[PDB]
Paper text:
[name], also named 3-chymotrypsin-like protease (3CLpro), is a viral-encoded cysteine protease that plays a fundamental role in viral replication. During the proteolytic process of pp1a and pp1ab, [name] is indispensable and cleaves polyproteins at no less than 11 conserved sites. Domain I (residues 8–101) and domain II (residues 102–184) possess an antiparallel β-barrel structure and take on a chymotrypsin-like fold, harboring the catalytic pocket between them.
Besides, [name]-[name]-2 VOCs carry mutations at varying frequencies in the [name] that are specific to Alpha, Beta, Gamma, Lambda, and Omicron. where Alpha, Beta, and Gamma have the substitution K90R, Lambda has the substitution [name], and Omicron has the substitution P132H. There is only one protomer in an asymmetric unit in each crystal structure, and all 1–301 residues could be traced in the electron density map. The mutant residues 15 and 90 are located in domain I and residue 132 is located in domain II. It is worth mentioning that the mutation of the amino acid at position 15 from glycine to serine did not cause any serious structural changes to the backbone, except that the substitute of serine formed an additional hydrogen bond with a surrounding water molecule.
Numbering used by the authors:
A (entry chain A), B (entry chain A): 1 to 300
Amino acid sequence: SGFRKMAFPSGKVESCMVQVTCGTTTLNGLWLDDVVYCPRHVICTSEDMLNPNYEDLLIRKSNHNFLVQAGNVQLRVIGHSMQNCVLKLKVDTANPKTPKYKFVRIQPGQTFSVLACYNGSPSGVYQCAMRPNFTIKGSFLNGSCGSVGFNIDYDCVSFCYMHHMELPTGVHAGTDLEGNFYGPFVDRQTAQAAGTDTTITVNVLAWLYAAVINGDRWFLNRFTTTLNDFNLVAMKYNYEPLTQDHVDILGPLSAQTGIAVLDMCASLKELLQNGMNGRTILGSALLEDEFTPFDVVRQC
Amino acid sequence: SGFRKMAFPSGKVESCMVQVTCGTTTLNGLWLDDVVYCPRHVICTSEDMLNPNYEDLLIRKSNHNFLVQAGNVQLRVIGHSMQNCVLKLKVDTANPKTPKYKFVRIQPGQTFSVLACYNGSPSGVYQCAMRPNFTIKGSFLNGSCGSVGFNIDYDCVSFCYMHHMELPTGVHAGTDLEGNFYGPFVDRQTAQAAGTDTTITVNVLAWLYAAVINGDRWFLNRFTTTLNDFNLVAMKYNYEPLTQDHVDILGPLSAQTGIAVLDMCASLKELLQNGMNGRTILGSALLEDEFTPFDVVRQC
């Protein structure tokens, strides 16, 4: 029992983390087989960032302009290419600790583990959700660019995020591992800002099921609402619409607890309309939306 | 920027985790050099647990009664001994991935990372605090006994916890790695229950400094209180007393922010007396007490 924000064990990813330096900029890279992946803005000067043409900037670079360090061993770069907003640095040594891996892009609402790194060295691991506005609320300091986000399934690491920048509100933006940004953000200096965000309704419901599984039942009621009438209340409170697919995904948790999804929705409606009246749910005084149905099943 | 409950990278510990079976009971063990550490209750039957004499139960066991699995390789047990509430199983193979390590006992109020494991396989990692009542609010299911808690300093893993049991309130109790329980709990079946708990004041203050460092300033005020008068309010709200040592430990965070500790205490007094009036601090609607001053410095 108990319920915690839980990351995947990070060992398989720690073994892929390297240091990448170009000019005076140092950041993190991901070493898989004979390729190191890092943010392409590693090749930029502070003045390049105002309006960079990365095609031009990369033509002016050579393999020897990239210094790659894997622990103490230096990795010889024998080629380089750009793939959208990431750089691919071919190196002369395949990573002997390359796990089985995939590059997968995730959906707003899904979660992943972040291995925060500095100078190629792992510093900590925590769980994040892709917000509906395609930002993540991470914990990143200067030098963390190139840190990656991932999930593990069986023995296979599914990489889904690499970190590129902090937006003015303190939230974070990055790309998938094919170099394509999540959301309408760019790796250049603009006034770009996070758009308005919404609460991930299906996750809040999943977490309410986690609470019931853990003996937190005070918010339950005998009422049941319809999908339509729930969604009228959701919109008012800046919650995402709930679909029948969401109801189906919550199926197993509904069965394990014996509480129908639309019954839980009536509880969520009441919580939204009245607050918690000084009580807590799974140790929180607000409605948590960064646990997916899978996260709850995996931990309960 | 940003602030998250962050665990240490777990790779060094994952490489030490093994499966230990005795009779029909399977749980987790920690493999360091040629020794595997696990909860001694692995040798018990459900009926032994009602009133076990572990001295008797262990005399009746042989090395071949213990089956130790490290991934696919079976580890031959060549000796066994009891050390308080842990078993030490000598095996014929030193763990080639043994990190630099120490066994340290922690203090209530300090934090550590938990690597939850099942059948010797790591499942997730999360941060915990040792509560003042010597329980931890973990996330543990059947089979998690033997999972360990740890901190990392430089390259050295300091093991501080191994998991033994769940108490009736759903909180968790275990030992240090010398087998000595945290708190007044025993590895036998009784009506034992967690005692009354208190809030870790110095940590709440640390987390308020983290919030200021991250731009959350709405709870600040121009007032300053005395240590004595703060502690009269702390007691009323079930907070631990604040000592001058606590003030000194908060020194660096005070200097980084320019807010004196006793100035912050006046903010905490107000928050305790009035609540948050529907606002949040670092994404929480309640006062968080599971981040130490070190945790804040490390992440900010």
